[PDB]
Design an enzyme around this catalytic site. Structure first.
Site, PDB file in Angstrom:
ATOM      1  N   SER A 176       0.865  -1.175   0.000  1.00  0.00           N
ATOM      2  CA  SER A 176       0.000   0.000   0.000  1.00  0.00           C
ATOM      3  C   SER A 176       0.901   1.224   0.000  1.00  0.00           C
ATOM      4  O   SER A 176       1.569   1.503   0.999  1.00  0.00           O
ATOM      5  CB  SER A 176      -0.932   0.010   1.207  1.00  0.00           C
ATOM      6  OG  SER A 176      -1.754   1.162   1.195  1.00  0.00           O
ATOM      7  N   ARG A 177       0.920   1.950  -1.117  1.00  0.00           N
ATOM      8  CA  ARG A 177       1.883   3.029  -1.283  1.00  0.00           C
ATOM      9  C   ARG A 177       1.529   4.252  -0.456  1.00  0.00           C
ATOM     10  O   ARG A 177       2.421   5.041  -0.131  1.00  0.00           O
ATOM     11  CB  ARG A 177       1.989   3.379  -2.757  1.00  0.00           C
ATOM     12  CG  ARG A 177       2.614   2.237  -3.491  1.00  0.00           C
ATOM     13  CD  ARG A 177       2.778   2.435  -4.961  1.00  0.00           C
ATOM     14  NE  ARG A 177       3.414   1.231  -5.467  1.00  0.00           N
ATOM     15  CZ  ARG A 177       2.755   0.168  -5.903  1.00  0.00           C
ATOM     16  NH1 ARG A 177       1.441   0.175  -6.047  1.00  0.00           N
ATOM     17  NH2 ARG A 177       3.429  -0.945  -6.165  1.00  0.00           N
ATOM     18  N   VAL A 178       0.256   4.426  -0.108  1.00  0.00           N
ATOM     19  CA  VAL A 178      -0.085   5.446   0.870  1.00  0.00           C
ATOM     20  C   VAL A 178       0.484   5.070   2.229  1.00  0.00           C
ATOM     21  O   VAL A 178       0.963   5.934   2.972  1.00  0.00           O
ATOM     22  CB  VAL A 178      -1.607   5.642   0.922  1.00  0.00           C
ATOM     23  CG1 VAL A 178      -1.969   6.623   2.010  1.00  0.00           C
ATOM     24  CG2 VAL A 178      -2.116   6.123  -0.420  1.00  0.00           C
TER      25      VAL A 178
END
Ligand SMILES: Nc1ncnc2c1ncn2[C@@H]1O[C@H](COP(=O)(O)OP(=O)(O)OP(=O)(O)O)[C@@H](O)[C@H]1O
Ligand SMILES: [Mg+2]
Lengths: 334, 50, 464, 514, 464, 50
Positions: free
Chosen positions: F26-28
């Site tokens: 999850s890049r967030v």
């Protein structure tokens, strides 16, 4: 040693770029000098004369089946038209154009008439039962010949009949004695059309009714008092059966066919100014000698050439125009 | 190596300056000869004496 | 009656003829390229009738320099290759033009390269064996008279020497002839083969037909058929047994695929032509015994990606009756003809065709030489002493068996001077029956190297 | 100075003439993506050079009854509908002569290095026939590549086509540049029968990479006999298609004149891509991997120019070193399979070997040179005969290096010999070895004089020995290079020198080798 | 003079012009969409000349709402973008329209997006190392100042996080100018980059051109060229050092493939356009630096299907001096930045440039990792005990080296929580020299995971 | 912006929801978590991948 060289090559590159600048400046000055000199009519005529002296020392798109079919059909027109008179030729052409319109309108009729077969009796019977009483008898022979020979594709059939419809008018001009006048005229209508792209585009009967296009042509083009009847009739026939070919190219091709009938080939000539009939005579004789057949010259006068003539016939061109010489000198510089 | 490279770089700079000066100097006579060159070029692209 | 070139699309040329004079398929048409640097006479082979008098042709020669509207003259017959005893000792291209003597053979009888194979009624119903005289071939991988033999190998395994051996044997035992169809032949290797045959003095018994790689796909596809027509003439007309080499057959298939792609045919399988099987059958099925004479064929086959399921080998092997695999192991150990006795296989080696004694002896030899190969790991890693007495016997017997499969090949007469040996099949069977039983295991290993038979083996034994 | 400058422009002005002659004109009816269709030019011939108004050039590569499909050789953005196309009347031809040595030229022969023009001795058309079977000769002269691996196990003979096949960043360009550099000692001889002239055809390579190759050749002094035919990635597909043929033509001019040439191509994988693009844009039917049917014909026609001509044709030669970039080491792909079939030998450079420290990463065993020993000098042949067998046995035994305590004495000896031979075939970049030094190195390896040196030190030993022999016992190298064989009189002296030097060597662990 | 839309098919629009006014290739035409919410001025870029006075163009904005017969005007010049010091600190799209301040640059100097690459005479190789602060990059694939760098990776392996990190490492203390080309990347990452640069006050020295993936194919093709035109202006007209960040350069070729078939080209390889190499070269050669004026380009390349053999990455590999290859195999282990130590390479990694101690350490690391990739299968199936003692100890070193090549990057504190770290090159090369020599073989593996340097390594070892 | 790669092998093994910890991302990241969960689960994904 590498550094030495690099500096020696830098010196040589300096030499090359200075030579490039010198050549560019010299080309600009020479172009200005020649443009100033050629500005005088006497100098321009002298350049054209030298050009002439230098020169002194010097249906195709149809596939095989359609080619042979059209050749046979034209053979016929020759015999059929060998008897008819001017009124007869006019009636023949009008009826051929009408049947061409009928074929174009009814796509199904075209296909089944153009579709090849070993025995043409069904197609001949169809043509008889559908047009025998309506049109003149002499039209029936040409149409039977057209529907009898095998055509490469359906569309070619139209191109056949329309072609014959054109030839008739030309033959009329041949018997009436205005064959050269009608050709000249066609050429004049050509550029007219080339001068009005909107007029040519709006003349596409492939997008609007043919009768409306002919009315537009009459109100715009053929209404001039001095227009020859044969040329106006030819142009009206062409625009009424244009079928997507650009009206300009259509009329230029019509003029090409008009000259070809007479066996001569037209050479398009561009010049800074017209150059007297003296010119025409000498240039026409020279071109005929080069190409071994009688030739007609059409002058596309334009000051861009800035001097001698540029001639194009068929796929070949003679380019001794001063502008071309300036371009050659500029490109050939180091 | 370093001396060879340094000598080469120094002579490259000096030669760049000297050759640039020589070129703009010679461009002066270039602009004199340009008149005759253009006259003869015109007398060629025209095919007759200018 | 002559046509005009209407389209040039690479090696594909479309020619428009008059209505009633379209050439029939596979006719050879001649066109002229008149540009000074590339002056040529293109030989186009009519591949399709596109309609409206257009015929699509594959240029057998590069089309660089062809001009639209150039006249094309129909020869009225397929690509015709010269045939006769005069074509021996010379090298030709796929079109029948001589390369070492241009203008040669233009007065010979010419045969169309397209001809149906023998009528079904004329095919031999029994697969006779071709007793070549080589111990390894005759015993373990008996060649089928009139069959096709895969020849796996490479450089430095004596493939060319074996080709010379077979040429000499077919010339001097069966009184026959050889035709070398160099399909996709590297020009360097073609010249090397030419000079090697000339030095061995076997060129006089060989007709070379090289379709070089640099040539367009058409000639590489038709060279096999040209050589096969020469072989067919030697068979039917001269009544000679013929041995037709093809190197490489996969390149015949590849040329067919390239031609199919050029003509717009949709590729099948792995990109091969849809007509792969038909082309391969028309090439191979003409290689058969008929009316008593037979065109045997040894075909160097390349298996792409080392995948025997690839359609090219998968279709070639449906026609091959035997396999000979030259190896660099066996070659390095001084065994010429360099045939790996175990990788190589033959489909005629069954007691129904070969004698029951022959099958028994061959199977015993294969069993021994397979044990020996299994024990070679032990020998090379833990030494011979690690083995048991029985194993060591078996190893000592297998060494002599595999060295006895070597032979003083006829092709070696140019180097060693001693004449080649032709051992009759019966003598080979008896010799290997004795050798597997251990009746000669007391002789030194050196007594078997390059020895032609059994009496010769005594005399190399008493000499040792 | 000023005298020369105008001298030239004035000379142009004068020699300049008012050319006026019949010319066949077509008109561009369609242009796009590097292909322009030209209506007209009835007399155009296939692969003819057409010139468009802006000085642009193209090749009439398709001819239909309707139009002529021409691939535009750069400057395509200046083509428009209705422009006049003027046929030159000659098939593609490139200038050739001795003046191309030291120059970088685009596939049309026009210099791009920024130096002066090239004095073209003659023009050769790109499509002249390759030498025939009768015009050739057996490849029998070595082409020393300077790489111990290639020269010992996959030798290249003058006239051979030795493919260099490998994945990206595996040592292909390095091998070819080393081969080019190794010819300087032959060039300085001044004897045309020893000089090798090189042509480096760069295809689809970024400009800075070609510049780096040029600098590598120049620092090693190899540029005075090397020509670069550069078709960087920026150039249209036409240049990337023609560059191999322009290199072949430049090399062929020298070949037919009796000189010996070496033609390198990085990479034919990029020329095939360019031809695929041109063919698909021209709507030619696609085959495997979308390549046109005649891609094999392309590469064969290109590589069959390479040959050794019979003495009747001057005895010159042209040696090809095509470079092809496999993907995931899949040598079975279309273009790799085609080139492997065409070429007389292969050098498979693998990334797994490259990472393991084997450089130049040539996978012995799979890499072959069908010419074989005929392309080696007698000394190299005799010394390296055992090398291939030893390396094969080493690769068989390498799984046992763990439990060698249980190996036979001969098996352990083979394992140790191979572990040192593989080190012996390692070689730093841009460090080619003359043939005599290679002979001495493989002599160290095969005769067992390395069996006492630790594997970690072989590379240093071989170096510090060769240098020593070069400095104090240069007689051995002179004998080898002058006679081409390592005679007993010289072999005994070489062994004496090896034993003399082994005393002076200090292995990396401090041990003593004697 | 104005044209007329004749045919609309997705992003491709055909326009018929009068005979004398057919626009030149790559010229910009303007059309108009008049429907409410979609109303706009549509920029088209002529791609082909179909003949009969027709041209075929790619639409920069969506063609939704466009009507047949709508007037099209020719601009007479290719799509032009603003250039100058004024573009620094602002956000632009492909057409040069400023986003954060609409109408900002409509008075700046405008340069054509289309220009030829620098002449070969001007190109000089670059061999100056660029110290980034990352262990893997600085050790195994050092980057070239003024050269070309790439960050290859499959779908979602950290290309954007690493490119943002490299912006943070090079650009944050860079003296010259920077240009970021968001070629078809995610818009959230672009906005995060914009805000991050604004917060660090680096935006004033950066020009951002975004062609994000919500935009049609043509603008994705041309955003890269627009950003590169700004970079070229900074390189040539101001002689300044420039950083040219691009993400993702694959989108250029992907858009080309998207419009390839509509524009009439037959397809090549796996669905790509035939002109893939030509377009990629025309774009990439413009990114090169010339002597005396440098562009340090570092462009992320997306690898479709995580297949490095795909034509697009394969072609891109040739235009690059340094290649950091991210792989999902490494990412799945957790070894951030997911660089494959082996497949990744750099041209400057030679003993003559980076040193002879750097080269030795890097090559020994590569040797160890390659050996541990060949031992991994044996370990997974047979067992680590079955290995040799040397191989076992090497496996321990290799695991520790893999985990030490990972690093807690500054721009990935949202991934790991802990702050970033910079390892100086000299410290990296000594750390890895120690590791390859077993100086740290006693520490646990986890001591080396996501730890930035020797001091942090000691701290984490003491923590464990 | 991420991926939660559900794998059948993990699902059968009893790992439900079956998130392959390694491939998933999850890049967030922490920015989409409350501070508490960011602190407790900061390194959880990488720890599980290891
Ligand atoms: N023998 C060698 N010893 C050490 N390093 C080498 C050797 N050969 C090549 N290299 C290095 O390997 C890397 C790749 O080498 P090279 O330039 O030959 O690549 P290539 O295989 O031709 O690939 P490409 O042109 O596709 O990038 C470069 O760092 C080069 O320095
Ligand atoms: Mg390379």
């Amino acid at each position: 040693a590498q550094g030495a060289q690099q500096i020696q090559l830098m010196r040589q590159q300096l030499i090359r770029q200075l030579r490039t600048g010198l050549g560019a400046e010299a080309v600009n000055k020479a172009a200005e000098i020649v443009r100033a000199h050629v500005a005088d009519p006497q100098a321009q005529s002298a350049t054209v004369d030298r050009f002439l002296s230098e020169l002194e020392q010097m249906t195709s798109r149809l596939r095989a089946a359609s080619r042979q079919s059209l050749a046979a059909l034209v053979e016929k027109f020759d015999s059929v038209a060998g008897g008819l008179d001017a009124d007869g030729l006019t009636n023949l052409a009008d009826e051929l154009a009408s049947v061409a319109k009928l074929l174009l309108s009814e796509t199904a009729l075209n296909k089944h008439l153009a579709e090849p077969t070993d025995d043409s009796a069904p197609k001949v019977r169809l043509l008889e039962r559908l047009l025998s009483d309506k049109v003149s008898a002499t039209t029936l022979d040409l149409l039977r010949t057209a529907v009898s020979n095998r055509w490469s594709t359906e569309s070619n059939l139209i191109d056949a009949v329309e072609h014959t419809a054109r030839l008739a008018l030309l033959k009329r001009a041949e018997i009436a004695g205005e064959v050269d006048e009608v050709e000249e005229q066609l050429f004049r209508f050509g550029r007219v059309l080339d001068a009005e792209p909107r007029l040519s585009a709006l003349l596409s009967d492939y997008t609007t009714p043919a009768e409306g296009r002919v009315a537009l042509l009459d109100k715009a083009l053929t209404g001039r008092p001095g227009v020859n009847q044969t040329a106006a009739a030819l142009l009206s026939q062409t625009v009424g059966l244009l079928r997507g070919e650009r009206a300009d190219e259509a009329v230029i091709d019509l003029a090409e066919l008009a000259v070809s009938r007479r066996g001569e080939v037209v050479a398009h000539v561009s010049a800074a100014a017209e150059l007297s009939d003296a010119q025409r005579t000498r240039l026409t004789e020279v071109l005929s000698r080069i190409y071994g057949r009688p030739v007609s010259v059409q002058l596309h006068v334009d000051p861009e050439l800035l001097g001698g003539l540029s001639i194009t016939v068929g796929d070949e061109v003679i380019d001794g125009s001063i502008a071309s010489r300036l371009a050659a000198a500029q490109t050939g510089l180091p | 190596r370093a001396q060879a490279s340094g000598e080469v770089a120094q002579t490259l700079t000096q030669a760049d300056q000297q050759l640039s000066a020589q070129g703009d100097q010679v461009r002066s006579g270039l602009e004199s000869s340009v008149d005759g060159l253009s006259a003869k070029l015109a007398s060629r692209i025209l095919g007759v004496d200018v | 009656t002559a046509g005009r070139v209407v389209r040039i699309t690479g090696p594909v040329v479309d020619v428009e003829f008059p209505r009633g004079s379209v050439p029939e398929l596979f006719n050879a048409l001649h066109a002229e390229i008149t540009f000074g640097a590339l002056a040529k006479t293109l030989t186009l082979e009519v591949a399709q009738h596109l309609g409206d008098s257009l015929v699509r042709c594959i240029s057998m020669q590069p089309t660089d320099g062809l001009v639209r509207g150039v006249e094309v003259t129909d020869t009225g017959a397929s690509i015709s290759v010269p045939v006769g005893d005069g074509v021996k000792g010379h090298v030709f291209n796929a079109l029948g033009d001589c390369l070492d003597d241009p203008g040669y053979g233009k007065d010979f009888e010419h045969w169309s390269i397209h001809r149906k194979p023998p009528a079904f009624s004329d095919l031999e119903p029994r697969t006779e064996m071709l007793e070549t005289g080589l111990k390894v071939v005759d015993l373990l991988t008996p060649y089928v008279r009139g069959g096709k033999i895969a020849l796996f190998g490479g450089a430095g395994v004596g493939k060319t020497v074996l080709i010379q051996e077979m040429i000499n044997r077919i010339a001097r035992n069966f009184g026959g002839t050889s035709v070398f169809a160099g399909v996709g032949e590297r020009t360097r290797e073609g010249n090397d083969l030419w000079v090697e045959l000339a030095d061995a003095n076997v060129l006089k018994d060989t007709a070379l037909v090289f379709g070089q790689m640099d040539e367009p796909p058409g000639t590489r596809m038709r060279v096999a058929l040209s050589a096969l027509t020469m072989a067919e003439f030697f068979r039917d007309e001269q009544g000679q047994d013929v041995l037709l080499f093809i190197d490489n057959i996969f390149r015949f298939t590849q040329a067919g695929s390239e031609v199919s792609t050029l003509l717009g045919r949709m590729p099948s399988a792995v990109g091969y032509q849809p007509t792969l099987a038909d082309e391969m059958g028309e090439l191979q099925e003409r290689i058969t015994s008929t009316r008593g004479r037979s065109i045997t064929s040894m075909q160097a086959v390349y298996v792409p990606a080392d995948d025997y399921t690839d359609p090219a080998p998968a279709t070639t092997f449906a026609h091959l009756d035997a396999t000979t695999e030259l190896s660099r192991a066996v070659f390095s150990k001084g065994i010429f003809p360099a045939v790996d006795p175990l990788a190589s296989s033959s489909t005629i080696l069954d007691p129904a065709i070969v004698g029951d004694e022959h099958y028994r002896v061959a199977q015993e030899v294969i069993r021994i030489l397979q044990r020996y190969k299994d024990l070679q790991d032990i020998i090379a890693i833990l030494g011979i002493d690690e083995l048991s007495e029985e194993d060591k016997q078996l190893v000592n017997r297998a060494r002599r068996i595999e060295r006895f499969l070597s032979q003083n090949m006829m092709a070696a007469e140019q180097f060693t001077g001693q004449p080649g040996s032709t051992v009759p099949l019966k003598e080979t069977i008896e010799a290997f029956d004795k050798l597997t039983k251990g009746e000669f295991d007391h002789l030194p290993e050196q007594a078997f190297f390059l020895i032609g038979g059994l009496d010769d083996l005594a005399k190399k034994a008493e000499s040792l | 100075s000023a005298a020369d400058i105008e001298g030239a422009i004035e000379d142009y002005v004068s020699s300049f003439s008012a050319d006026t002659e019949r010319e066949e004109i077509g008109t561009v009816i369609d242009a796009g993506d590097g292909i322009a269709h030209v209506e007209g030019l009835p007399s155009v011939m296939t692969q003819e050079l057409l010139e468009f108004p802006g000085g642009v050039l193209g090749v009439a590569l398709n001819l239909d009854e309707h139009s002529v499909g021409a691939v535009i050789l750069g400057e395509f953005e200046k083509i428009e509908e209705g422009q006049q196309v003027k046929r030159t009347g000659e098939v593609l031809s490139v200038p050739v002569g001795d003046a191309f040595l030291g120059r970088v030229v685009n596939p049309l022969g026009q210099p791009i290095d920024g130096q002066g023009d090239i004095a073209a001795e003659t023009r050769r058309a790109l499509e002249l026939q390759a030498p025939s079977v009768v015009q050739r000769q057996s490849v029998s002269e070595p082409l020393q590549t300077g790489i111990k691996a290639i020269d010992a196990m996959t030798p290249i003979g003058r006239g051979q086509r030795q493919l260099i096949i490998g994945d990206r960043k595996t040592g292909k360009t390095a091998v070819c540049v080393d081969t080019i550099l190794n010819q300087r000692e032959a060039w300085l001889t001044g004897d045309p029968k020893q000089q090798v002239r090189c042509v480096y055809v760069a295809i689809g390579q970024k400009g800075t990479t070609i510049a780096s190759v040029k600098r590598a050749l120049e620092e090693g002094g190899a540029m005075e006999y090397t020509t670069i035919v550069a078709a960087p990635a920026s150039d249209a597909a036409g240049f990337k298609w023609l560059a191999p043929y322009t290199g072949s033509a430049i090399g062929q001019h020298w070949m037919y004149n009796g000189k010996h040439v070496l033609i390198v191509f990085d990479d034919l994988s990029k020329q095939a891509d360019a031809y695929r693009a041109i063919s698909l844009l021209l709507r030619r039917p696609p085959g495997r991997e979308a390549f046109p049917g005649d891609v094999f014909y392309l590469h064969s026609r290109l590589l069959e120019r390479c040959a050794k001509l019979s003495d009747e044709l001057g005895g010159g030669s042209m040696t090809g070193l095509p470079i092809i970039e496999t993907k995931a080491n899949d040598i079975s792909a279309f273009i790799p399979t085609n080139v492997i079939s065409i070429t007389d030998g292969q050098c498979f450079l693998e990334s797994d070997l490259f990472n393991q420290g084997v450089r130049p990463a040539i996978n012995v065993g799979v890499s072959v040179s069908r010419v074989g020993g005929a392309a080696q000098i007698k000394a190299m042949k005799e010394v390296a005969g055992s090398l291939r067998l030893d390396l094969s046995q080493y690769r068989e035994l390498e799984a046992f290096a763990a439990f060698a305590s249980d190996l036979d004495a001969a098996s352990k000896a083979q394992l140790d010999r191979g572990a040192r031979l593989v080190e012996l075939l390692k070689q730093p970049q841009y460090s080619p070895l003359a043939v005599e030094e290679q002979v001495v190195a493989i002599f160290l390896g095969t005769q067992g004089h390395l069996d006492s040196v630790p594997v970690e030190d072989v590379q240093r030993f071989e170096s510090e020995l060769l240098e020593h022999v070069k400095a104090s016992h240069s007689d051995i190298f002179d004998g080898i290079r002058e006679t081409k064989k390592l005679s007993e009189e010289a072999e005994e002296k070489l062994v004496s020198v090896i034993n003399e030097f082994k005393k002076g060597f200090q292995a990396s662990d401090g041990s003593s080798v004697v």
